[PDB]
């Protein structure tokens, strides 16, 4: 039987020891997460806002060739 | 005049229809499976109770 | 609010109002037109030609964008005249605000030359 | 100093090809 | 009897100095902005012309460099960092990519990707030559200025991420007009609401609009996208640490394992699909072409919710290879990263840095426990997230968010350091 | 002018089971049709 | 030499994603046999009937109609679900040919004709996410009873 288990043992050890290691290693960060939380959206939005306005020069300049 | 023609339809053999769409068979079948385990099912717990 | 926070709102309002959003809302033109090609297809058209009194939706946002770059350029320059700012930044501000002031004006004047064949002719 | 004129100037000038084309 | 091949083509390329200067973010503002202007101008400048308004550029600089990072296998770069090669592994990419882009450009010019091969004029070949040569080389030298710390590191990363910012979020609010064949409709899905309100009493149907629109699609996709965007930050922010000795610690990198693979994992499938389509039981295809028969069709990604409703069993086949590559075929990236135990050990010996507790020497066995296990949730689950998003339909996001928002994280911690200089002062 | 349709109402035709045929005849003319005979 | 007629079985009524059924009568007034070849239906733009929007499956009939006889054909189609609330040009064509091979087409009809999981899976449930919020907002904001003054 155990020779058949040999196929199971890598899967079991890698998964179970990985999860043990992960939880022992990377304990929660929630409050500082709250400190980054607003800035996440602010930076996402404002850096998108760059292109969201820069695009507006180019649509009508395309008319020089295309919009005839 | 002529009516519409539904066209070529397949008449299924009764056996084939039953094979594809045959209900009460399970209703009758369910009981037929019980007797296989009647003896050990009762004896196991009876012995456990006599010793647990 | 502080004065700057009101001024920012006024500038953002100037953008939309000068782009004629109150025309878009009630007359509701498309963003661009289309016109027949000689082979019979449709080429889009960005400007409603000869109609000084008419506009497409995106034409107004393009023009008002140029107007905003023009207005903000002098604000960037006047900001640029401060003595605390390390000079390597200062010559930039004199670059960015200056090219804003010129390029937005010239492009707006070209766009108006496109709207009216015969303008200043 | 010059990196700005290195990286920007030729490109913005390279607008011209599609300006005419 | 290829490092000898470097000599004839190397230092001729321009390069730039390093600053002997204490440059700050406020000062770097411009130098960043230049890069933004250039990249965006490339994005926004080119019925076929109309569709075009709605083709290598950056992509060679990515692919060539990553290919060289794969060729670092078999110890080939263990020629090893020294003054005489202090950047030449990069420098090689600077020409090898350049010529590979030129080759690609010539191949599609010969194809005539747009235009018959002479009747529009041979001068457009010269045009395309200058166009691509200039564009790509300038872009690369941008990324170099940033890595030279007049910026921060990679630009091209940030650039594509900004392109993702647009190509996602622009569709939320862009007031540009669309027509179904009904009349006046808008691109920006959200604001349509305010005109629908002036159009209809049918508030319930106005809301169902948020769930209908099939092209430039309905808000429900945006809502899913937002939720994904928000969630992922939870995962990516996690990190783990070890003490280090000549109150100081080395942060064990975690999702660094996620950074590299998915590009390859998606690409290999997509490309083998394309190949099988072009070469042709294996696979047959309907009109974007899509598979509808053969193994490739049983293999096909069930992106549609309709695919869910028609058959659940199919999806396991797609999962089996798509996830299983993350499970097993990834394992070889120890070489690609160059971060096996006896690689990281070498790196830390170059650092000359040792942990508390047990020997430098046995530290190989110490760190071994952590080294394979990093590949698990550090990598594969980012693929699981990607597919989650994609089959929920998060717009273009199951590629984009993964990198883009990670880059937002990096930029955030930079922003923290610099602006926190402001906030402390 | 008569329009007539023949439809099979059964989802499945089965040997030895009832098969229901429906004939619907519609007069779309301006006058009445007389001596209308259906034969199948 | 041919007369066609159309009869909508359910009336001129407009389901979205349900079966519209109509009958096409074909009356041969000629002296030669006509062969009714196919019956096709399409939705087209009401402003220009040259642009097809949705072609329905053509029904191949291949029925010979002798002179001074009539035939009647049932056809049924399903307007697409996204067609709700829109006007479309409905064109129903009947293709037939004589024994000589002359193909004729008649536009028998050429007129402009006018899951609860969706509601459950957010609009309903958002108010149950609010139940979490009401609980946690209690356990947070009830703490705000610790800055009175002597």
Short mmCIF file of C-alpha atoms in Angstrom, two decimals, chain C residues 25 27-32 42-44 57-58 61 79 86 88-89 92 95-96, chain E residues 21 26-31 33 37 47-50 170 175-177 184 186 195:
data_model
loop_
_atom_site.label_atom_id
_atom_site.label_comp_id
_atom_site.label_asym_id
_atom_site.label_seq_id
_atom_site.Cartn_x
_atom_site.Cartn_y
_atom_site.Cartn_z
CA UNK C 25 -27.72 68.36 -23.00
CA UNK C 27 -29.70 69.93 -28.45
CA UNK C 28 -27.83 66.64 -28.01
CA UNK C 29 -25.66 66.39 -31.15
CA UNK C 30 -23.33 63.43 -31.68
CA UNK C 31 -19.63 63.58 -30.86
CA UNK C 32 -18.75 63.53 -34.57
CA UNK C 42 -18.75 57.23 -44.62
CA UNK C 43 -15.81 59.22 -43.28
CA UNK C 44 -16.50 60.62 -39.78
CA UNK C 57 -20.14 66.78 -28.27
CA UNK C 58 -16.38 66.13 -28.32
CA UNK C 61 -14.38 69.35 -24.87
CA UNK C 79 4.22 79.84 -9.52
CA UNK C 86 15.75 74.93 -7.01
CA UNK C 88 16.74 73.13 -12.20
CA UNK C 89 12.99 73.02 -11.55
CA UNK C 92 11.31 73.71 -16.29
CA UNK C 95 9.38 75.59 -20.08
CA UNK C 96 6.06 73.86 -19.34
CA UNK E 21 23.72 64.49 -6.59
CA UNK E 26 10.12 67.17 -6.24
CA UNK E 27 13.19 67.47 -8.46
CA UNK E 28 12.48 64.20 -10.36
CA UNK E 29 8.93 65.43 -11.17
CA UNK E 30 9.85 66.68 -14.65
CA UNK E 31 12.11 63.83 -15.61
CA UNK E 33 6.78 63.74 -16.73
CA UNK E 37 4.40 62.71 -22.34
CA UNK E 47 -13.57 52.00 -41.54
CA UNK E 48 -9.97 50.97 -41.06
CA UNK E 49 -8.60 54.35 -39.96
CA UNK E 50 -11.59 54.77 -37.65
CA UNK E 170 -11.79 55.52 -19.26
CA UNK E 175 -18.81 60.86 -22.62
CA UNK E 176 -17.99 59.87 -26.20
CA UNK E 177 -20.91 58.83 -28.36
CA UNK E 184 -27.57 58.61 -29.33
CA UNK E 186 -22.57 57.03 -24.82
CA UNK E 195 -29.91 60.90 -19.64
#
